Amino acid sequence: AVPGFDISHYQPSVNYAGAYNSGARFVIIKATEGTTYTDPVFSTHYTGATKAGLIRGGYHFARPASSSGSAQADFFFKNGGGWSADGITLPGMLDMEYGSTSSCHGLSQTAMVNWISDFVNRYKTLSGRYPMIYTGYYWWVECTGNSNKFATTCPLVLARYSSSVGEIPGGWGYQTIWQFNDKYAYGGDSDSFNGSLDRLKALAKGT
């Protein structure tokens, strides 16, 4: 496994080099939310991560009631979700979260799958590759009907704050990344990539 973490403007200051020296090899950084919000610390975190030798990518906090998935993929891509095969860039991550007022943001399971499809496919044409999908197990089960539509295309980032990853939703074989606590020492959440640093480098390169 390879250690990493994820951060946002909730961590205004991060010791990127200390994280690397402690064993972190990647970081996932909030870029955008909905149609209108850019995380003000994105560029600070992305620059610091780069110079410290962390592999890094951005994430988009989905707000499916606010706009189409296509519109949010365009916004993400333009504001930190870009990807190239430079060797140090993760595919962008689509962050599916419980809603402000209801778990599934007022969408039916089929509407939610359609909304994610539009995000995922728009991101693919813009970047060249499918995004990662972040979810918890019960969120995916209730909000998508435990959809398997993305299981062969989008790497799974599975959140479960336990000693074990637990059941894998959606017909994915396995999670690519496990978010296993919300208490990373340098700030933000703790992540673990499933496999070795060479396998992680291959994920970033898109080989």
Numbering used by the authors: 1 to 207
Authors' text:
Muramidases (N-acetylmuramide glycanhydrolases), also known as lysozymes, cleave the bacterial cell wall peptidoglycan component at the β-1,4-glycosidic bond between N-acetylmuramic acid (NAM) and N-acetylglucosamine (NAG) in the carbohydrate backbone. The characterized enzymes from GH25 exhibit both β-1,4-N-acetyl- and β-1,4-N,6-O-diacetylmuramidase activities, cleaving the β-1,4-glycosidic bond between N-acetylmuramic acid (NAM) and N-acetylglucosamine (NAG) moieties in the carbohydrate backbone of bacterial peptidoglycan. It is proposed that, as previously suggested for other GH25 muramidases, that Asp95 acts as an acid donating a proton to the glycosidic oxygen of the substrate, with the N-acetyl group of the substrate rather than a second protein carboxylate acting as the enzymatic nucleophile to stabilise the oxocarbenium ion-like transition state.
For TzMur, there were two independent protein molecules in the asymmetric unit, and the catalytic residues are Asp95 and Glu97. There are sulphate molecules from the crystallisation medium–one in subunit A and two in B. There are four glycerol molecules bound in each chain, introduced when adding the cryoprotectant. There is some residual difference density in the active site not good enough to be described as a ligand, the situation being complicated because the final crystals were obtained from the re-dissolved drops collected from other trays due to shortage of material. Three of the GH25 structures have ligands bound, and, while we have not succeeded in obtaining a ligand complex, the structure of TzMur has four glycerol molecules from the cryoprotectant, three of which are in the ligand binding site. While most of the surrounding side chains from the binding sites superimpose very well, Tyr10 of TzMur and the corresponding aromatic residues from the other superimposed structures all have different conformations, indicating a high flexibility of the entrance to the binding site, which might facilitate optimal positioning of peptidoglycan for processing. For both muramidases the optimum was around pH 4, independent of assay.
